[PDB]
Structures are given as C-alpha cells and as structure tokens.
Design a protein around this ligand. Structure first.
Ligand SMILES: Nc1ncnc2c1ncn2[C@@H]1O[C@H](CSCC[C@H](N)C(=O)O)[C@@H](O)[C@H]1O
Ligand SMILES: [Mg+2]
Ligand SMILES: [Zn+2]
Lengths: 215, 44, 135, 29, 128, 76, 17, 416, 46, 268, 98
C-alpha cells in the first residue's frame, strides 16, 4: 500500500495500520512491523512499508533504516537473538515462583532463502550473504556486513557453508562447515583471553614485573 | 544361622528395578566390610 | 552490663501482650521516600516497611493500589517506589491506643510465623530478648 | 476556632513545626 | 448444541486442551532413588511433622489448636486409660484422627515397631 | 445471663451492644468498677456491632462513681 | 500464649398384647 | 479366586490444575451431554469432621472487590491499562457481571494467565444455558412474561455496555478483547453462570469478592447439597468440603448450593436453569381456602422452624413422595394455626378440594401439559440449550403443581 | 519442585538466602527435611 | 540425628522417666507393686530398658543451655536411648543454643501433664522454629564444615589460564544419573567440565548475556553458544535442545535438594 | 504562649513526644548498625513506647483530678484535656527503662 522508503527516521504516522497484512516482530524495546504479502508459508516479506511501535501499542512510526532495503518480495527465515533473564523474584504470596525465566530478544535476523526457495523444496538452502538485522535498542533495521572465506566467490555450493555470528550480532562470517569449532573450544577461548588479561593486570603491580616471564 | 532374604522388590518401569536385601546375624564389624565390598562389586 | 541491661529491657515491656485484633486507631506514622536533604537509601525504606499494616488507602491516579488495614508486602513497597508515592501511613506500636497491650494490626506480621501476629503472644518479652541478646 | 486559625527533624520555628505536623499527619485542625 | 444421530444417541463435542502447556512435560517426572529416604522419613516420624503443619493451616490461633488437642487427648485418656502410655500415645492418636478426619489415611497414633528385632530381649543400639 | 450469652456465642451468634448493655446493667451495681470496665474494654476494642453507645458509657460511669473505695475521678 | 483468655415414660406402659 | 471371577473427562483438564497445586481427593471429573460434573471416584466414608474434596489455589482465580473501589486479587491489571477505565465506569450495584466479563476477556488475552488454558473447558455459546444467549423464540417458551422482560432488559444492558465501550476508536489491546458483541455477551453469560461471591481474608484484609474460581464452578447446584465451600486464609486456598458425617457413595455427584432461598425464576435468570424440587417455589393462591399447617407437617414428617423445614427421612422409610416439592407446598399453601386447636376433617376436605380446583385451573391456563413437554424433549433433535431449558422450566412448574395436588390428596386421606 | 539451577557457587550468604526462600515457598516442614539432607551433603564433601 | 531428635544417656533417661517405667512394669504384670518395680529398676534388669525405650516414644523433653539469651536457648526434642553418658545433640541446633562441643553441658526436663507435652510437641520443636524472632533470619543454617563442603562441591571448573597451559587456538551425558555414575566409577572428577542434556525449561542462573558465537547452518539449524549452555534451534522445526555445561558438584547439589523435596512429598 | 487551653499542652506534648520517639529509635539503631547487629524496628519501638508514654503534671496545675508532679499517662492526659478545663497542665517527660 504505502511506501515508507526514504521517509523520516523517527516520525509518528497519523493513522493506525492493519496488522493482518504485516509481520509483527516483537523485541525487548519495540514491536517491528514489515508488510506481509499473502502466502501459505507466510515467509514472504515486503520491506517497502515498515513500522516500529513501542511494545503492545498501536502508535505506529516509520523505523530508521541504515542500509538499502529490498524492493522485490523476498522469502526470508526469521531467527531472534538475545539472552535469558533468569531472576529470583521476591516471594510475596504463598506458592510464589522461586525463579522467573524470560527471553529478552534484542536482535532479529532475517536471512533470505536462496533464490526464494521454499522450506518444503528438497533443494532449500539459506543465503547467508543476504541478512537483515533488526535492533530493539535503536528501533532500526540494517543489512549485515557478511564476510565470506569459503572458496567459490559468488558461485559455490551453498550446502557446505556455515555462518558465524559474534560481537553482539555485529560480526558475520561465512566458513566451511568442516572447520566448525567446538562449543567447548569457544568457551575456553573466551575464558583464556579474559583470565590472561586479568592475570596480567594483577601481576602488573609487582615491581619485578618488568623483569619477569610468562609461562 | 547366617541367612539372607529379599525384604522388598519393585518394578517401577521396564528400565528401573529396585530391591532390598537382608543378611543376619552378623558379628561386630562384619556388616560394614561386607557392605563396602558388595557395593564396590555392584558398582564396577 | 548486658545481663543487667537485658533484665531492665525485659522488665519494662514484660506486660505487653497481643490482646486485641484492632484497637480502632486512625493515627498512622507517615513514611516518605523522598527528602530534599538526602537521597534515601531504598534498602532502609524496604526492611522497615515490610510487615506493616497500612493506616490509610494508597492511590495511583484514580486507582486504589493498596487498602487500609492491609499488610505491606514487598511487592507493594516496590510498586510504591516505582511510582511517585511520597506518603505512606502505617500502623506501628507508636500508634496503638494502649500502653499496657498491643493489637494485631498495630504490631504487624509475626516475626517468625509469616502471617499476622496471633492473639496472646508475649511480644514484649520477645522485644526485650531480641535487643539484649546481641549485647 | 481562634486556636484553629492560629494553628495555621521538626523545625524549631513553632509555626513551621505546626505545618510539619499537618504535613506529617501528626496533628490537624 | 443438541444433536442426535438418528439412533437415539446424542452426539456432543468433547472439550480438549487444544493448546501447548510446557509445564506438563517438565513437571510430571519422578525421582527413582528415594526408597531409603522415604523409609527413613517414615521411620523417624517426619510425616507427623508434615501433618502438624497441615493441621495448623486451618487454625486462626495456634494456642487454641494446642489447647483443643490437649483437651481431646485428655478425653481419650479418661475414657480408655489402659490403651495409652505405651506403644499408643494419646496426643499422637489425636493428631492421627484429626488427619484421618480430613480423609488422609495414617497409621493409628503413628505407632510403628521394628520387624527386624532378633527376638525378645534384644534392644537396638543407636549409632550416634 | 453470662452463661446463656457464652452459649449463644458458642452456637454462632455473637453478642452485640444490646447484650453487653444488659450484662453491664448488673455489673454496674457490684461495687467493683473493674468488672464493668473489663466489659467496656471488651466492647470498645471489638467489632462494629459490639461498640459502646450512650447506655454503655452511662453504665461504666455509674460503676465508677459509686465505687466502694479509692478515688475514681481520674477514671471518670 | 496457651494461658491467654483463660485457656421415664414409654416404659412400664408398652402394649399389653 | 481372582482368576475364576457419562464419560471420564479429558486428563489434561485436571493435569493443568494438578501441576499448579490443584488437588482433588476422592472425586473424578466426568463429562456428559448436559455438561461437566464432579463425582466421587470411590466411597467417601463419613468422618467426624468435614472432609477435604478439592483445593483451588488463590493465584488461579479471577477475583474483584464486591464493593467500591475495584481492586483485583491477584492484581493482573497493569497500571494505566484502559481496561481499568472500562471497568471503573460501571454501576457499582448492578454492573458486577460486566466487570467480571472484562476481567475474563483480559485474562483470555493474557499469555501467561492460567485462564487462557482453563477457558477452553468453559461451555461455548452453543453449550451455555444462560438466558442471555436465548433468542426471542426460546424466551417465548418460558410461559412467563416477567422472566422474559427481565431477560430482555439484561440483554439490552449488556449490548448497550458493549456498544458504549467497544466503539471504533478504542485501542487495539481493547478491540481484540471483544471484536464483536456476541463475544462480550458470552463473557457476561459465563460470568453470571459461574461467579462465586464470598467473604475472604487475605493477609490482614477482610473483604467481599466476586470470584471466578476454576474447578469449583464445575460443581453442580442442589438445595440439599453434600458439599460446601470454605476459604482457608493462611495459605490462600479455597476448600471444597463434604458435609461432616454425611456418607457419600461411589458415583454420587458432588453438589453445592449456588444460592439459598431463591426460587426457580431467579435461578433461571442467573444460572439459566431450574429444578423441580425447589423448596422455595411459590404458587399464588387466593388465600380463601386454608389447611392446617401442623397436620400437614406431621403427615409428611416435615420438622423445624419455617426457615428450616426438613424431611426426617426416617419415619418415611421409603416414601420418595416427600421431597423439596412438599416443603415448597407447605411454605406456599394457605395455612392457619391456633397453637393446639385441632382441625375438623370436614373443613379440610372442602379446603383441599378448592385448592385442587385452583391448581387444576392453573394447569389448564398453560397451553400444554408436562408429559407432552417431556415427550417433546425426548423427540427434540435440533433445538438450542435455552430451548430445552425453557421447556424444562415450564415442565418443572407443572410438576410442582401436580405434586401439590397429590400431596393434598394424600394429606386428606391420611388425616383420619 | 521448580527449583532454580545454581551453577556458580554456594557460599554462606547464598545458603542463608536459599533457605529463607525455601521456607517462604515450601514451609518449615519441607525446609526442615531439606536442611537435614544438605547437612549430610556438606559433611560428606568436607 | 534427625533435626527433631536428641540422645539421652540410660541413667538420665531412667531417672527422668522413672514413674513411667514403673507404670510400664506394673501394667504388663511384670511387677507386683510399686516397691517391687522400684527394686527391679535399681537392679538394672534387662526388661527395664525395653519398657523405658517403649515409654520414651512420643514423649518429648526440653533441652537448655546455661546462658539463655533468647527463647531458642531452650528447645524440645524427641529423646532416644544412646550408649554412654553424654547427651547427643544435632549439629544444626548448636547456633541457637550458642553451643560448641568443648565442655558445654545441658539440662533436660520432662513435661508431665498432657497439656505440657502438647505444648512442647506443638510449639517448641526445632522444625517449627527455623526463623529467629529478632529479625526473621534462619537460625538452622549450615555452618563451618557443612558450608565448606557445599562451597567445594559447588566450586566449578578451573577456567582460562588455570585450565589450559596454552591458548586453545568434554563428555556428554544423557541425564544427571549417568554423570553421577561415571563419577562413582572414577571416570570424571568432581570439578571436571561436562555437558548435561537438559529436558526442562531454562532455569540455570547465569549472566544475562547474548551468545558468544552462533553457528548458523544453511539447512536452517543454528547453534547458540553461551558461557554455560548450548542451545540448538531450527527454522524448519519447533525443536529446541538445551545442554548445560556444569560439573558433578552442581548436579549433586541440585539433585540433593530435588530428591529431598520429592522424598518428603512421597512420604506423605 | 501561642496556644492557650489544652491545645497548648496537648500540641506541645504531642510535638515533643513525636520528635523524641524518632530520635530515640535512630540513636539506638545507629549504635547497633555500627556493630553489624540487625534488630527489627518493632522491638525498639516496643521499648521506646514505654519511655515516651507519660507526662508530668506541672507544678502549678492543682485540682481534685490531678496533683502537681503526678506521673500520668499521655492518653489519659489528653482525654481529660478535652473533657475538663480544671488546670490540666502537663509536659512530656522521658523515663528511663528503670
Ligand atoms: N442441578 C442442575 N441441573 C441442570 N443444570 C445445572 C444444574 N446445576 C448447574 N447447572 C448448569 O451448570 C452451569 C454451572 S457451571 C457447572 C458445569 C457446567 N454444566 C459445565 O459443563 O461447564 C449453569 O449454567 C447451569 O445452567
Ligand atoms: Mg563451649
Ligand atoms: Zn493498635
């Protein structure tokens, strides 16, 4: 219907949209709306018209866009990004819960299907070079800076690549599936780096630190 | 005379069986040694 | 010295027993979170208010969020802190209409039993022992 | 009524103290 | 909502959950290795502690509860003096009866013995 | 009267100001103000239907002003 | 605590039959 | 030797409660064509005191203060929600059901609320027996203009409230609560048919509440019930207690008294049903012909004061005739009493003949009879729940009049 | 039992706070048995 | 000992319960009169102890240390017969009595009337006095040796430079019982890291942080790697697998508390 | 001097006692909190209430109801203030726990 492309970044529109034709993407700080063309899979997205609202509110506003957006309908797969908030709420009434776990979603990744193939397609693979990032804190949407290391360039076998996301959803890198790292290796790398820096900070205050070795 | 008997048995499921066994009369210190050896044998 | 102090502490309040459900008082000690002379520490604002019985209704806008003669839970206190509730009126031992006994509402929740204090409880001796014990 | 009209840390000033008691709900008309 | 399928039988819609509750799968699971723990709890008499706590959930005043239990035990002893003081205690009988009056089955007066006593004269030596 | 009032409250009907005034009508002439004052304290710090009225205050004052010994001016 | 608040007709008259 | 020798409810119905500290003892939930009900899964032996049947935790209820101001326990409505503004504009005296309907819709829209799951076992619009869902055809079979007028006024009030508060400009969080009018009408019907009012103490606060209580609204109504509701304040639990010393056999339905001292018309107005053994039903007699109250009570063994008439059930032995209908007759028949003055039988014959004439005139005033109404119910195959409810209501009134006639006959027979 | 899964450490402050929350949630009869079991576990690992 | 029990020497118990032992002797016709029963008690006959052990069941006693500073300085316990001449005391009630085992002594009292026994059983037992009246804090909290044991049990893996000598450029268990069994068979240590398959909701206390690294596959499945757990999700399915990185110690602590709760529930 | 009939004695005693109770609890709690001792405010308020519950009949207030220097309760003094005008003159007194 309407074309929000090129409009203001944080202005509030003067009408209430119909959410039956939109993709409602709910994050921690906002609910994100992207126009949904009809489809049995409901995986088709139209990025020309987008809106951002505070969570559970019908005061619509055009979101801030930090990168060029698609013009033709593209089929995409949605995956959220965030943390868990396992708290111990105070026990007020009888049988009050001992803990409370919630999923604080801060980023939503929209990854294009390769050639807009369907999930039921036996040749379905994901196109990791086409990822759009939705940020709750900034109420914005961007395109991911994807770095490709697997040989092949533009033309390759999409079945053998693996995407790695680091740095709070900012680093996107494509590697071969063979060189995937163990979760233990990732955790140990982070622990080793942090503890190495902490130990060097602790030992720096000794007056023979300049004539000492690490081992 | 020294005798043994099963004093309890159950089958909660097909992969969970329980049993309780007795051994008496015993002299002082024998029961602990028998229990330790039997537990090691049962577990490994 | 503490043994002498404990005996005098128990002595002065040995006769205080919870003997009524409600003395019928309307007075209430006012508790304020915001004071322009010091930024109040929320930790002190909580532990003192827990277990107290409100002497007056609390309103947020046109909605009543806490009623008179209602035990102050920790959820209500945080709600009071979350919004701008500058006045809280509570029923304390200072507000009871007697110096020979106290009622259930002016005392508050039981120190050990979780619920409101029960009739016939010798809260005076417990008060005297609680202060003199760590001496 | 005359005393009610005249009635209108607790500060050392007597009328400031009266106003404080009115605000702290210690005493009122 | 009324509909008969031509044979006198009335066909009606069954009510179903038709929704997902994640608390069902995660909560209806049983620990398998508490046989000795349950047996020891029964042997030492913590079920009576649970019963005492349960009885006080319906009492406004606990002192009144204690007085009523003592009065009922006194009536028990006065009516049948010879039945109490040994393996049966009057207060335990009162507590078991008050628990049983709620429909919860309990052994009478929480009276239990050791089936493994090696004949008369042998006394269990407690291991401190 | 006291036995019947105890039985009435045991049966589930609590005493109101009427029954308490009836009881005070006899306690006020016993020569001991403490009995009537105990009844008055029971009434004053109780429920709404037990609260004293003019007749209750009159009974307690009459009990105190016609005491056998000691001074009761402060109490009145 | 626990001390608070002070803690024959129809006989000899049956049917003769 | 062992070798030689109504349907059960959906297990998830009790399982969702059970995982949330709901406990049912000695009873099982069974579902039939009429609706859900609670029945003793075994023989509930009579004990000295009342027995615990069910335990419903407070946190699974939807309760609102019965008196102004409106505070909800537990507090599910957030501060600043427009649903509070919708609730707060209601009439404090008569609009109690509207507030409960608003709370029900709000809870149904709440993702973590329990009633989002329990709401799938409530009767639907085509299964609820409330008269707010009845059309003009069903109300025409009540054969009572007053009840029809009351139902029409209630429907008008509900629709007016919905139109006033659910117009075009309402926010989306409010419009989705009730997109169309019949959704709110069904919410109000559920509130009216399942609300329980009680005086509950929470902590130190004692107050009256209008409560939507799961697993306790499934109990059915009776004027001689075997169960009652008791609130346990210390742990905030509502207990369903069977009467002390009253034996209950396997398969016997567990019932409570929804409201004592209410005739069939009020039951139809509120819960959308009526019973033939209502001991408070009234039949307007002329009052010129009167019988002896004491003899009528003694013949049928009805004892107690006028507000506690009860059949002894011992001297009768096997007389199924004496039931709540006879008690209602004794409470409604024109009677005279002169302490110990005996009645002359001759005057009693004339009085009962005149009263029977009045009863037969009343039966003739109805276009149809009760037996033909039962036949219509048996042959009924394509009618709404309210249709059969109205048919049963008029049939029960006819049965009550016939019971009065038979009681007068046997009373005049046994007077000698 | 909807117990949270502690995965960092149990010190003196944590065990005192955990017991207080268990009393509020489960009551003193349940927590009394939990204390007996935790007492053995702490002794058995020391 | 249980939290509601104490141990009494034979001499103290036979002195305190002497009249009840006399009643037990006479009641079952083993003593002709009071004098004969007392003579039997003086002779330490072997049947005196059976009657004493029988009559001590269900009859509470009151213990008391000397400087009674608060009301928890006297508590009620269920006495049992222990060998020796010392009073056996539970370790978790020592803080309330302010008692340590370097020479302290206690006095024992026997409630006689039914009212006193009811008061002792229903008001003074330790399992109903877990909170201190002063501020409401727990009084029966594990201390010292138990606290050290719990601290060592729940002290997790060595991490970072304390785990590997060089910069890195663990078993998987289906259920906690498998991990504990492997620990019993000396396959793993108390603090060696392991991955535990989790089939409940996310209930592990951890820092509220985004995944360290997300391994997204072109087929749709992606692995989210956190500091203490791994979560496998897919876009085609609604499946969600959780693996917790922990030790045998955390598993043991959680299982201890869970089994205590479940066993107490099942025993009732 | 500002207020005459009992509003002089009543309000003066009320203001003195309200200020005394606040500072009495603060000083006691400050001493214990400096030592790490945790005591609820209720226990101290039970003790202070007995400290600040009496008034002293002034040396010039003489009648047949009270005598000068007599130690009477605060609530009794205020109730007789509204009911009599017979020189009910009193001032708040702080009593030690002994
Ligand atoms: N004794 C009775 N006879 C017929 N209907 C009854 C009844 N008692 C209650 N009801 C009906 O049951 C409703 C109360 S909710 C009770 C359970 C309901 N039948 C269900 O299946 O969900 C009321 O609307 C009323 O119409
Ligand atoms: Mg020592
Ligand atoms: Zn009070």
């Amino acid at each position: 219907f309407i074309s929000t492309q090129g409009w203001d970044s944080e202005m509030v529109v003067d009408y209430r949209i119909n959410e039956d034709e939109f993709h409602k993407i709910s994050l921690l700080d906002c609910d994100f709306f992207i126009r949904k063309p009809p489809d049995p899979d409901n995986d088709v997205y139209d990025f020309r018209e987008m809106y951002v609202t505070p969570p559970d509110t019908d005061i619509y506003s055009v979101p801030r866009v930090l990168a060029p957006m698609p013009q033709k309908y593209i089929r995409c797969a949605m995956s959220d990004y965030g943390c868990y908030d396992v708290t111990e709420p105070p026990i007020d009434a009888p049988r009050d819960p001992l803990y409370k776990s919630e999923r604080e979603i801060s980023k939503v990744f929209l990854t294009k299907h390769y050639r807009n193939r369907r999930l039921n397609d036996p040749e379905f693979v994901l196109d990791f070079e086409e990822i759009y990032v939705i940020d709750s804190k900034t109420k914005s949407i961007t395109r991911a800076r994807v770095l490709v290391t697997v040989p092949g360039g533009r033309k390759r076998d999409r079945k053998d690549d693996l995407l790695v996301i680091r740095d709070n959803g900012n680093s996107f890198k494509i590697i071969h599936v063979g060189e995937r790292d163990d979760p233990t290796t990732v955790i140990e790398r982070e622990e080793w780096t942090k503890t190495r820096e902490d130990m060097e900070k602790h030992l720096r205050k000794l007056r023979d630190f300049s004539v000492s070795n690490w081992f | 005379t020294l005798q043994w008997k099963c004093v309890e048995s159950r089958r909660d499921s097909k992969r969970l069986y329980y049993g309780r066994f007795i051994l008496s009369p015993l002299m002082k210190g024998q029961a602990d040694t028998i229990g330790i050896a039997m537990r090691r044998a049962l577990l490994g | 010295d503490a043994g002498y102090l404990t005996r005098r502490l128990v002595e002065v309040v040995q006769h205080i027993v919870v003997r009524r459900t409600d003395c019928g008082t309307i007075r209430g000690i006012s508790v304020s979170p915001r004071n322009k002379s010091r930024m109040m520490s929320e930790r002190i604002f909580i532990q003192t208010l827990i277990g107290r019985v409100l002497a007056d209704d609390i309103y947020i806008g046109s909605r009543c969020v806490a009623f008179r003669n209602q035990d102050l839970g920790i959820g209500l206190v945080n709600r009071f802190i979350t919004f701008g509730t500058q006045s809280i009126s509570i029923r304390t031992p200072f507000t009871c209409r007697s110096t020979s006994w106290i009622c259930r509402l002016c005392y508050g929740r039981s120190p050990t039993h979780g619920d409101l204090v029960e009739l016939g409880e010798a809260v005076g001796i417990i008060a005297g022992q609680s202060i003199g014990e760590p001496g | 009524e005359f005393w009610k009209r005249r009635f209108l840390w607790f500060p050392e000033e007597p009328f400031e103290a009266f106003k404080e008691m009115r605000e702290r709900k210690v005493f009122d008309v | 909502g009324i509909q008969r399928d031509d044979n006198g039988r009335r066909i009606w819609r069954r009510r179903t959950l038709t929704k997902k509750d994640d608390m069902l799968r995660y909560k209806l699971q049983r620990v398998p290795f508490v046989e000795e723990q349950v047996r020891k709890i029964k042997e030492v008499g913590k079920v009576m502690t649970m019963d005492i706590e349960r009885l006080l959930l319906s009492e406004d005043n606990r002192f009144e509860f204690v007085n009523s239990v003592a009065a009922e035990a006194t009536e028990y002893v006065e009516k049948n003096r010879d039945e109490y003081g040994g393996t049966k205690k009057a207060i335990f009988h009162v507590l078991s009866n008050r628990v049983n009056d709620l429909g919860f089955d309990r052994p009478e007066a929480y009276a239990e013995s050791d089936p493994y006593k090696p004949g008369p004269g042998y006394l269990k030596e407690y291991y401190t | 009267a006291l036995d019947i009032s105890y039985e009435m409250e045991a049966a589930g009907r609590f005493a109101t100001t009427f029954h308490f005034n009836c009881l005070l009508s006899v306690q006020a002439t016993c020569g001991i103000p403490e009995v009537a004052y105990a009844t008055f304290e029971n009434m004053e710090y109780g429920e709404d239907f037990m609260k004293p009225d003019t007749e209750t205050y009159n009974w307690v004052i009459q009990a105190y002003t016609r005491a056998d010994s000691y001074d009761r001016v402060q109490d009145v | 605590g626990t001390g608070f608040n002070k803690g024959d007709i129809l006989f000899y008259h049956r049917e003769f039959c | 030797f062992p070798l030689f020798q109504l349907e059960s409810a959906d297990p998830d119905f009790y399982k969702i409660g059970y995982v949330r500290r709901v406990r049912a003892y000695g009873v099982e939930f069974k579902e039939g064509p009429d609706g859900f009900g609670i029945y003793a899964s075994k023989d509930i032996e009579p004990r000295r005191r009342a027995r615990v049947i069910m335990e419903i935790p407070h946190e699974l209820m939807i309760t609102i203060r019965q008196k102004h101001p409106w505070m909800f326990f537990p507090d599910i409505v957030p501060i600043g929600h427009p649903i509070f503004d919708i609730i707060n504009s209601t009439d404090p005296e008569r609009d109690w059901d509207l507030r409960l309907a608003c709370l029900l819709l709000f809870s149904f829209d709440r993702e973590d609320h329990f009633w989002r799951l329990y709401g799938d076992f409530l009767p639907a619009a085509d299964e609820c027996s409330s008269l707010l869902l009845a059309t003009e055809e069903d109300l025409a079979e009540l054969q009572d203009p007053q009840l029809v007028s009351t139902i029409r006024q209630q429907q008008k009030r509900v629709l007016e409230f919905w139109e006033k508060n659910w117009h075009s400009g309402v926010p989306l969080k409010i419009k989705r609560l009730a997109e169309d009018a019949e959704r709110f009408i069904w919410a109000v019907s559920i509130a009216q048919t399942r609300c329980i009012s009680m005086k509950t103490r929470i902590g130190a606060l004692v107050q009256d509440l209008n409560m939507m209580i799961p697993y306790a609204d499934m109990l059915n109504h009776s004027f001689e019930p075997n169960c009652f509701l008791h609130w346990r304040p210390k742990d905030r639990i509502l207990e369903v207690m069977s009467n002390a010393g009253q034996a209950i056999k396997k398969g016997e339905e567990m019932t409570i008294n929804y409201m004592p001292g209410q005739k069939n018309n009020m039951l139809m107005e509120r819960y959308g049903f009526s019973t033939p053994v209502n001991p408070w039903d009234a039949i307007p007699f002329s009052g010129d012909s009167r019988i002896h109250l004491n003899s009528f009570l003694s013949v049928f063994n009805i004892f107690g004061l006028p507000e506690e008439y009860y059949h002894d059930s011992e001297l009768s032995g096997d007389d199924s005739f004496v039931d709540g209908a006879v008690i209602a007759a004794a409470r409604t028949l024109p009677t005279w009493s002169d302490i110990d003055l005996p009645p002359i039988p001759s005057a009693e014959r004339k009085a009962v003949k005149e009263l029977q004439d009045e009863c037969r005139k009343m039966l003739a005033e109805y276009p149809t009879t009760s037996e033909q109404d039962q036949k219509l119910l048996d042959s009924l195959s394509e009618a709404r729940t309210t249709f059969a409810t109205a048919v049963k209501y008029r049939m029960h009134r006819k049965m009550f009049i016939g019971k009065i006639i038979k009681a007068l006959d046997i009373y005049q027979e046994r007077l000698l | 039992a909807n117990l949270v899964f502690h995965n960092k450490v149990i010190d003196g402050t944590a065990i005192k706070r955990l017991i207080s929350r268990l009393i509020d949630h489960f009551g003193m009869a349940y927590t009394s048995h939990i204390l007996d079991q935790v007492k053995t576990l702490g002794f058995q690992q020391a | 000992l249980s939290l509601h029990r104490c141990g009494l020497p034979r001499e103290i118990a036979i002195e305190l319960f002497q009249t009840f032992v006399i009643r037990g002797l006479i009641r079952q016709h083993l003593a002709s009169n009071i004098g004969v029963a007392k003579s039997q008690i003086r002779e330490k006959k072997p049947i005196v102890w059976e009657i004493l052990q029988e009559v001590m069941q269900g009859h509470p006693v009151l213990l008391n240390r000397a400087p009674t500073l608060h009301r928890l300085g006297i508590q009620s316990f269920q006495p049992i017969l222990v060998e020796g001449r010392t009073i056996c005391l539970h370790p978790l009630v020592c803080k309330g009595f302010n008692a340590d085992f370097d020479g302290d002594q206690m006095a024992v009292h026997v409630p006689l009337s039914l009212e006193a026994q009811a008061e002792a059983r229903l008001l003074m037992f330790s399992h109903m006095n877990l909170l201190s009246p002063a501020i409401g804090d727990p009084i029966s909290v594990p201390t010292q040796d138990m606290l050290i044991g719990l601290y060592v049990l729940t002290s997790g893996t060595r991490r970072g430079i304390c785990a590997n000598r060089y910069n890195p450029c663990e078993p998987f268990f289906c259920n906690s019982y498998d991990a504990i069994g492997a620990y019993r068979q000396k396959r793993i240590n108390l603090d060696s890291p392991l991955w535990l398959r989790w089939q409940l909701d996310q209930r592990v206390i951890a820092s509220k942080e985004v995944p360290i690294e997300v391994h997204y596959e072109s087929f749709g499945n992606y692995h989210e790697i956190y500091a203490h757990y791994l979560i496998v999700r897919s876009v085609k399915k609604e499946t969600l697998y959780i693996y917790i990185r922990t030790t045998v110690g955390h598993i043991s602590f959680y299982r201890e508390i869970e089994e205590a709760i479940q066993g107490f529930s099942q025993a009732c | 001097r500002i207020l005459g009939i009992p509003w002089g004695f009543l309000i003066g005693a009320e203001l003195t006692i309200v200020q005394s109770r606040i500072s009495l609890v603060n000083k006691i709690q400050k001493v214990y909190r400096s030592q790490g001792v945790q005591i609820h405010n209720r226990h101290i308020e039970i003790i202070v209430r007995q400290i600040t519950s009496k008034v002293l009949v002034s040396e010039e207030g003489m009648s047949n109801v009270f005598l000068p220097g007599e130690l009477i309760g605060l609530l009794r003094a205020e109730r007789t203030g509204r009911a009599l005008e017979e020189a009910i003159c009193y001032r708040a007194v702080l009593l030690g726990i002994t």
